[PDB]
Amino acid sequence: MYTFVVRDENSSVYAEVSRLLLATGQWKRLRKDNPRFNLMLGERNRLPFGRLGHEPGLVQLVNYYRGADKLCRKASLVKLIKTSPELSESCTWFPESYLEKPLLLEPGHRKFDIRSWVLVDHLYNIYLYREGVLRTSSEPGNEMFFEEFNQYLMDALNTTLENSILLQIKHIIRSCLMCIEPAISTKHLHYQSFQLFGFDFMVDEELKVWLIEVNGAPACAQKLYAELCQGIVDVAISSVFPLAPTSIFIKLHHHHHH
Amino acid sequence: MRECISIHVGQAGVQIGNACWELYCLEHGIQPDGQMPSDKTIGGGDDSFNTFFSETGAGKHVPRAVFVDLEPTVIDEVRTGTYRQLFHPEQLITGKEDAANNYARGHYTIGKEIIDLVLDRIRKLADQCTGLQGFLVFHSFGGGTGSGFTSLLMERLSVDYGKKSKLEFSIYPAPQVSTAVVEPYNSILTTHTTLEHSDCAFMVDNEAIYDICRRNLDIERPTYTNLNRLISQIVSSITASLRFDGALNVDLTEFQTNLVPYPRIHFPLATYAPVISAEKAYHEQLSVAEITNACFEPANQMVKCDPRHGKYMACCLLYRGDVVPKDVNAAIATIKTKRSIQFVDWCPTGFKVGINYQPPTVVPGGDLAKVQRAVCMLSNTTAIAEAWARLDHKFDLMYAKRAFVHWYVGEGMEEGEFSEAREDMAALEKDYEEVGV
Amino acid sequence: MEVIELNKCTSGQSFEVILKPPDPSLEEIQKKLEAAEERRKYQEAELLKHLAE
Amino acid sequence: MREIVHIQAGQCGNQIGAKFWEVISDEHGIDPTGSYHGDSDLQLERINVYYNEATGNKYVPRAILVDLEPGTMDSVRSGPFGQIFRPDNFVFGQSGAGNNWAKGHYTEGAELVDSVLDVVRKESESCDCLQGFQLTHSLGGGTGSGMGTLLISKIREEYPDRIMNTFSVMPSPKVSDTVVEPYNATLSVHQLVENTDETYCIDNEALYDICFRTLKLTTPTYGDLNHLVSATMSGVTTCLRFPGQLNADLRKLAVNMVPFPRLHFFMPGFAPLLTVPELTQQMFDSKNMMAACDPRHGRYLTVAAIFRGRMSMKEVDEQMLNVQNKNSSYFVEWIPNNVKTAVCDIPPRGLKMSATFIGNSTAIQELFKRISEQFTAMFRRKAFLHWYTGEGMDEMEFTEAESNMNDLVSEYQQYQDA
Ligand SMILES: Nc1nc2c(ncn2[C@@H]2O[C@H](COP(=O)(O)OP(=O)(O)OP(=O)(O)O)[C@@H](O)[C@H]2O)c(=O)[nH]1
Ligand SMILES: Nc1nc2c(ncn2[C@@H]2O[C@H](COP(=O)(O)OP(=O)(O)O)[C@@H](O)[C@H]2O)c(=O)[nH]1
Ligand SMILES: [Ca+2]
Ligand SMILES: [Ca+2]
Ligand SMILES: [Cl-]
Ligand SMILES: [Mg+2]
Ligand SMILES: [Mg+2]
Ligand SMILES: [Mg+2]
């Protein structure tokens, strides 16, 4: 019988994850400050990473990466992309730190920003949820999902979402995450980590993707909470705490020799 | 040649003490009966090992050590053990009735009874020192003697030897081997009282040592005997510079200078490698590159914490065995580009290195395998403050209900000292927070 | 990466490599001890008194 | 902190004390003549904790046998190990105590108590370092209950800084001798709350139910109940009788087990009545508790487990860590790591391995409520009081005892909600 603790009640996502764990009759919820837990759905600020992995007889796992805020903080991210040699001053996909020439959907002559959900498990596998969403201005949901935004591209521009956009997105995600892996990985650490991230993008008229910001405590599109959350417990929680397809995630792996 | 006297307090200190001296003797080629063939200056000398051993006309090398415990059963083992001949009876002091895992009992009640005797038996060692450096105090945080009597001793050493340096080897409490529920209390109480009187303290968390034994020595359920031998090795590396010809950390003052910018932040993290099973049929010897790399694995530290999420104020590398600078530099070259090694912006991001060509010595019939090179890394990282955090939380939980507090007040202490000691620890956790920011 | 202050002897060597530049008195203790001692003696007195009652 | 002085008082007290000595004597390789015939030497390594050394390498129990009538003590002096006790350490009157606490505490007992303290004294004076006293007795009679708590008070006076530990058999209607047992028990509990550091609450209810439902004995005798008791007493004292690091003496035990001075009444448990997993499940279930309380009706403040025999230390620790992790609700959150485990290589007689449980649970309040309920049912109507007022006692004394125990129950409850 695996035990877990909830320390963030405002979490749209993990509140749903909690429901699923109870719904498997093989996970029981302890009081928020009981230390004898397997899993911690910890708080948003001042998560006491210092008191994890110190309970003998318990494999302990938490749903946040200590240090990942460097990515999730406007000022930190910007600082990270410059100083970080691997990212370089170079890197086409990041604004100098506004887009005067964004892409536009028709009818409506409207702009938008893309949101992709990424899961990084304890082994630092990078998983990209096959479903994203667009937050559009209905002025010259508003929620636009891939199937139809893919269909639109095949019509308006004679191309696909995969080719014109999703290749760069996967590149940006892989670049930002594998850049800070040495600072946050829990590979030989006394506790384990996983975390759901939200990346926000822009697409200029030339169909070039641009990174906006990264959120470490993202919500989800209403109808997707179900599918995504099941995936979170599937590949991030059940993987460390096994129970007694067609994955919804694209495993971002790429090893070019040179 | 300046002498160094060791003081082993309580069961942990005594039992760990007995292991270090067994090791030292093996390392300096000193036999149980105390004879030392390779030593040619009979009944005298100012060699490097004379800082830890004195000589008698009969050619016996006597540890400059005092064992203290408020109960005799543990020290009685020394009196009758393999090295009974080594020590002189005056060096082994025992009381009748222990502190019952109670700081207040060890400090106030029973401490007052036995303190003066101890200071005398120590004075007798000091009188035989031409240039005493200071003391190395070994003890636990959790024991009543180890916590309560030690801090009294430390207070009084600072009086009777105000100029001398005092180093600490402290066993930080771990439930997997802890013997008491109140060890959090004792830990804070002894830290608060000893803080100003300790120049440099090396914390060894039994949790970390326990797992290293399981993980690397394939020991199902480690005993103190296992724990103490790994601990003895780490201690040996740290004191080797004082016992062998060298130029790094040659005296107790140098430890302070090289590892302790701020007085209150005097708890250097130690990391040791490699630790290999003796019952290991086939082993492939590790290089400078590999062992220097392990020094940055939390799984090899004496305290489980994450330096990646803190800043360094100093870092010091002590090698033993087949090593030369080029290899160390080249190993450091690589490591820097593959790790998150961040110093406080107001310090040089460098490494003070020391190599003793003599590879680590292991006890015959021990769990540790012989290696050709090893390394202990002392680094003052703010990350070790995680250990104060864990402790301060456990303390807060119990004290909130005043659980067990009556046992301390009953011995003459006062609830006040509980909250004073806790506030000071709150300061410590903040001082680390600033430096570390 | 500058190696400095290299020292060599028969049993090893040391050096430094830099990567990048930037008390209570005797009386004072006896009183606390005696202060606690009396508090003990007092509590014992209260007990023996209570028993006497 | 080496020698313990053992005192046994009254019929019950002497009957369980006699078995305790027979049992541990066996474990330590001592025979009825006092001669050692053991194969191991762990048997002798701490033999001084309970035995003195007499002439001719004879070990004599540091035991003092008390009673206001001769019968039961004459019975002991005839039993198997009857010749092992120092003849001088038999102290008895002729009048008896008539199952009356007042007679044991105030009248018949007062007359006998000094001669007992004379023996207690000579045993103490030849102690290299006495740690404290352990008393065995019932709380429902008169000698063990009334004189026993009288002894405790005097002993504390003459040894204020030593540890007082008792094995106290609580009365139950299911195994009753007289109707005034709730009076005697209530009066004693009040003495115990003030004058002991640790008390093992051995409930005659629990002991009977265990003999009937589990051991399947259709009609159990006091002898049967005393088989369980002597076995439990063996287990809970193992850490004091053999080389160990946990609760190795009475004071360290008290420091680990008693977070608040008044809450020192323990719930013992034993198993079996066999893999490490099976030991660890049984020792923890109600049906192995020697106090008729449901631990699931309260929370644990502290717990002391002891495993005996050759077994895997790794598995013990796995099993102990797992019981807590899987019921972490019943252990209080404000005392980190309140469960301590010990292991001893020497198992009891006839068993390959066993486990002994000692729990400071807040469910223990149920035992005090039961007594309080019985006590009140009679006191309300002042029934059977004349037996006590005839010895000089006043109602006021009863009203206090009732109140002081009600408090005790209120304390256990407040810490169950914290
Ligand atoms: N590493 C190691 N830890 C020990 C050893 N002995 C005891 N400890 C630890 O020390 C703590 C208990 O303190 P002790 O040193 O045993 O007790 P003490 O200092 O003798 O004080 P009292 O016995 O209470 O008078 C526990 O946390 C133990 O895990 C040892 O030999 N090696
Ligand atoms: N378990 C057990 N309980 C006993 C025994 N003898 C008496 N009792 C209980 O103790 C109470 C009677 O007290 P007892 O010791 O006989 O009277 P005392 O000699 O005046 O102290 C009742 O609750 C009995 O059930 C015994 O041998 N074993
Ligand atoms: Ca010499
Ligand atoms: Ca008379
Ligand atoms: Cl001086
Ligand atoms: Mg924003
Ligand atoms: Mg001890
Ligand atoms: Mg009777």
PDB file of N, CA, C and O and ligand atoms in Angstrom, chain B residues 123 132 135 157-164, ligand 5:
ATOM      1  N   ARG B 123      45.362  17.794  31.785  1.00  0.00           N
ATOM      2  CA  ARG B 123      46.473  18.663  32.160  1.00  0.00           C
ATOM      3  C   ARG B 123      47.785  17.884  32.225  1.00  0.00           C
ATOM      4  O   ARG B 123      48.833  18.389  31.830  1.00  0.00           O
ATOM      5  N   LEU B 132      51.804  22.439  22.677  1.00  0.00           N
ATOM      6  CA  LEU B 132      50.473  21.901  22.417  1.00  0.00           C
ATOM      7  C   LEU B 132      49.685  22.748  21.419  1.00  0.00           C
ATOM      8  O   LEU B 132      49.534  23.957  21.600  1.00  0.00           O
ATOM      9  N   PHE B 135      43.112  20.486  20.769  1.00  0.00           N
ATOM     10  CA  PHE B 135      42.421  19.232  21.018  1.00  0.00           C
ATOM     11  C   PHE B 135      41.555  18.785  19.850  1.00  0.00           C
ATOM     12  O   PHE B 135      41.098  19.598  19.042  1.00  0.00           O
ATOM     13  N   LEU B 157      37.652  23.957  28.504  1.00  0.00           N
ATOM     14  CA  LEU B 157      38.896  23.928  27.758  1.00  0.00           C
ATOM     15  C   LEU B 157      39.218  25.353  27.298  1.00  0.00           C
ATOM     16  O   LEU B 157      40.355  25.806  27.416  1.00  0.00           O
ATOM     17  N   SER B 158      38.201  26.067  26.816  1.00  0.00           N
ATOM     18  CA  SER B 158      38.356  27.453  26.373  1.00  0.00           C
ATOM     19  C   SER B 158      38.814  28.374  27.498  1.00  0.00           C
ATOM     20  O   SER B 158      39.310  29.474  27.247  1.00  0.00           O
ATOM     21  N   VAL B 159      38.634  27.919  28.734  1.00  0.00           N
ATOM     22  CA  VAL B 159      39.103  28.650  29.905  1.00  0.00           C
ATOM     23  C   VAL B 159      40.542  28.265  30.237  1.00  0.00           C
ATOM     24  O   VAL B 159      41.421  29.122  30.302  1.00  0.00           O
ATOM     25  N   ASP B 160      40.778  26.968  30.421  1.00  0.00           N
ATOM     26  CA  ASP B 160      42.090  26.465  30.825  1.00  0.00           C
ATOM     27  C   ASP B 160      43.127  26.466  29.694  1.00  0.00           C
ATOM     28  O   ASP B 160      44.326  26.360  29.951  1.00  0.00           O
ATOM     29  N   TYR B 161      42.669  26.577  28.450  1.00  0.00           N
ATOM     30  CA  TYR B 161      43.564  26.609  27.289  1.00  0.00           C
ATOM     31  C   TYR B 161      43.020  27.573  26.243  1.00  0.00           C
ATOM     32  O   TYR B 161      42.706  27.168  25.121  1.00  0.00           O
ATOM     33  N   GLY B 162      42.908  28.845  26.614  1.00  0.00           N
ATOM     34  CA  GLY B 162      42.226  29.831  25.793  1.00  0.00           C
ATOM     35  C   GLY B 162      42.848  30.043  24.428  1.00  0.00           C
ATOM     36  O   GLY B 162      42.171  30.448  23.479  1.00  0.00           O
ATOM     37  N   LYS B 163      44.142  29.765  24.323  1.00  0.00           N
ATOM     38  CA  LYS B 163      44.880  30.029  23.096  1.00  0.00           C
ATOM     39  C   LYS B 163      44.841  28.834  22.142  1.00  0.00           C
ATOM     40  O   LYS B 163      45.058  28.988  20.943  1.00  0.00           O
ATOM     41  N   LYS B 164      44.550  27.651  22.673  1.00  0.00           N
ATOM     42  CA  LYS B 164      44.610  26.419  21.885  1.00  0.00           C
ATOM     43  C   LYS B 164      43.395  26.245  20.978  1.00  0.00           C
ATOM     44  O   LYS B 164      42.317  26.774  21.251  1.00  0.00           O
TER      45      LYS B 164
HETATM   46 CL    CL E   5      46.347  28.889  26.657  1.00  0.00          CL
END
